[PDB]
């Protein structure tokens with residue numbers, strides 16, 4: 019029904035948590051998983067991350083003990099999500115924010131906490147925690163040098179594990195009705211996995227707890243798992259560290275699963291494709307860990323896995339196939355890239371223009387002609403489309419007539435006002451895959467932008483016609 | 490309590506909606522609005538848009554009437570959000586998706602609809618609806634040319650308004666306990682405003698219904714409100730059209746408010762700054778319309794405004810200050826750009842290097858020196874940091890990281906310097922202002938001056954140096 023949100027909320031802080039649990043039947047069918055893979059969609063919170071809970075909780079704990087007054091400054095090292103949570107709490111309750119985060123983290127997080135009025139200091143990616151330039155070290159320095167500064171230190175604050183122990187684990191227990199068999203959590207600061215695993219093993223001791231640690235970190239036990247890649251940076255952000263935080267109770271976890279960046283990202287893409295959950299890279303890491311760990315289970319029993327943050331923090335980072343190509347990551351089993359690679363193959367627009375028989379050339383105009391003369395030329399030449407020379411764009415007779423009737427195109431007005439400005443430059447050597455990719459952003463694709471002696475325009479409908487000629 | 494999500498959900502479609510209502514006390518205090526401004530945070534749905542509801546429900550209607558079977562293809566013209574909703578519905582229930590959307594719309598929508606495995610064809614932005622190259626006309630053509638293809642036509646499908654009439658407006662009424670005085674809705678296809686306004690006027694006739702359409706659309710009544718910008722393109726996505734959709738009943742709405750791009754985006758950033766709602770531009774337009782319409786209201790009464798979609802669809806578009814500067818929009822009264830403009834002004838890094846006093850040339854290394862020789866030279870020169878050459882510029886190296894990596898088993902003594910150097914860096918020049926280097930420091934930890942006369946760098950600059958400079962002023 020409507021119990022948590024049926025009322026009126028005083029602020030965004032009152033909208034943190036209460037994240038739904040969804041069954042990943044399609045992904046399990048894809049990967050051949052017998053058990054029920056449940057997903058705690060923590061990325062659906064108000065801040066789009068699991069760290070909203072610990073941010074709100076640290077702020078409430080600070081205010082409860084009188085350790086924090088209005089106008090004070092908050093400094094916090096984070097991979098990006100705790101910074102966003104604390105910036106939200108500060109913008110709501112009137113606190114100043116100064117964030118220290120490594121340069122490796124995506125720019126979306128920095129821009130988001132900039133929109134929230136948080137000063138952001140960046141730290142080198144390769145710097146260990148001991149260094150003078152670590153995000154925690156720079157946080158401590160800023161705390162020392164600044165007046166009325168505060169650091170809640172999510173790496174050691176007791177609120178971080180205790181709140182996942184109090185509300186999050188209780189949420190998953192109440193919705194799973196107590197019957198939980200396997201719990202897969204990503205290992206960052208470790209407060210989440212500690213709290214959740216402890217609270218679920220208290221009331222459901224038969225449940226197994228497996229932690230996910232990226233290849234590069236030293237959080238998994240024993241070190242024989244880390245020796246694959248020790249202290250080497252990874253493209254996934256949010257999980258893994260070069261030290262055990264105070265809130266991480268490594269004795270709560272039963273298994274550890276090392277996951278690389280490629281597997282994490284391809285599993286996140288598979289989640290988005292098959293389930294429709296806009297999740298982050300750490301979610302893909304956790305889901306691949308679950309796919310590796312829960313294979314011994316059968317139907318009936320349920321394995322819950324966390325989805326820490328949403329795609330918002332990595333919109334331009336890993337959703338874009340170009341960045342996946344620059345890193346050489348397998349995009350997905352079922353995706354548009356491989357579909358186009360299979361259907362088009364090595365076909366280039368030379369083959370299409372030759373098999374069609376387009377020995378014609380689209381007429382040209384000086385891009386400053388009047389509507390009267392261009393209408394005369396369009397009616398006398400019998401062709402439909404025209405491209406304006408110099409590129410400015412394209413112009414069709416239908417748009418000409420409709421805009422002239424719509425009161426936007428006077429007869430004496432220049433063509434530049436009524437032309438189509440969106441265009442994509444191509445050349446005959448380009449493959450059909452790349453022009454199909456470019457058509458995702460531009461409606462038309464003009465060729466030959468040698469000499470300006472292009473032949474015509476190519477669009478998606480022509481690609482579908484080409485796909486109908488073959489096969 | 491826990492009523493809607495206390496159980497397990499079979500799919501993502503069962504997790505859309507149920508969006509909470511938040512009171513925007515801080516934004517009202519900032520803008521000086523006496524009444525209670527309620528915000529329906531529709532952007533927090535599973536798909537991050539208000540169109541998730543209409544997509545799910547149109548698919549439910551198609552399946553319930555036997556008009557849709559597994560394996561079929563779904564085609565729909567959209568500004569980006571209805572496409573996302575129908576793509577989620579298709580990926581879950583096993584349908585094929587082909588989307589037609591104008592090129593004006595953001596690239597994040599295109600990329601995310603590619604992630605759901607949907608074919609995406611674009612249409613020219615300046616194309617009128619009568620053109621055969623418009624998204625709706627191209628969708629009709631694709632339906633004509635393809636087998637088992639269907640168009641649900643959110644512009645004419647009666648599910649679109651009736652869902653907001655059935656569930657969304659009921660949610661608003663239950664959350665407001667019936668007492669609603671004003672309701673402000675953005676006018677795109679017109680389904681949401683029609684449905685919600687009708688359902689509230691049925692149960693709360695005292696409630697006024699105000700519609701928001703961008704300057705450029707012709708949905709306002711009378712036409713004297715459009716003559717500002719007749720059929721002029723706008724940057725906001727989701728609201729306004731060049732024709733009245735079949736679902737929009739313009740008689741349901743009482744007032745109309747025109748909003749431009751600049752006001753919409755400035756109000757969206759102000760919402761993000763003061764309330765903490767990662768929301769989109771059309772919501773800023775709606776909130777500006779509400780601020781201009783409910784000014785006459787007094788304390789106690791409630792003015793409800795809908796926020797259709799989230800910032801995810803405009804992450805790189807309007808959250809980034811660079812693009813808003815490219816379009817010349819006032820970012821916000823209180824923001825980092827104007828704060829730095831005020832605190833720093835026209836100050837350049839030469840003033841900082843002169844006031845502190847550099848009179849020095851930072852040590853330099855060939856970036857292939859052994860750790861033995863670099864530690865020897867650093868101890869003999871007494872300096873702390875060093876800059877390493879090409880193996881362009883590679884970066885900086887500090888003795889702290891040297892020692893800590895050496896003991897960490899990551900720095901051999903015979904290893905090259907490039908292993909331990911910092912690879913994130915930003916190129917600067919003495920003439921650069923403090924504001925631009927402060928902006929660049931948001932992405933790079935270090936900033937080196939005068940890179941590539943002669944390659945004679947004068948020093949390295951960090952945020953702490955800017956704070957120390959601000960400590961010499963008041």
Ligand SMILES: *Cc1c(COP(=O)(O)O)cnc(C)c1O
Nearest residue numbers: 099206207208209210256300326
């Ligand atoms: C915080 C976070 C996690 C989980 O970290 P914990 O320390 O275990 O709470 C996972 N992924 C991302 C991206 C995160 O930001």
Ligand SMILES: *Cc1c(COP(=O)(O)O)cnc(C)c1O
Nearest residue numbers: 570677678679680681727771797
């Ligand atoms: C669709 C949409 C609207 C309005 O849609 P209606 O159905 O006409 O209410 C507003 N903003 C955005 C971003 C949209 O996508």
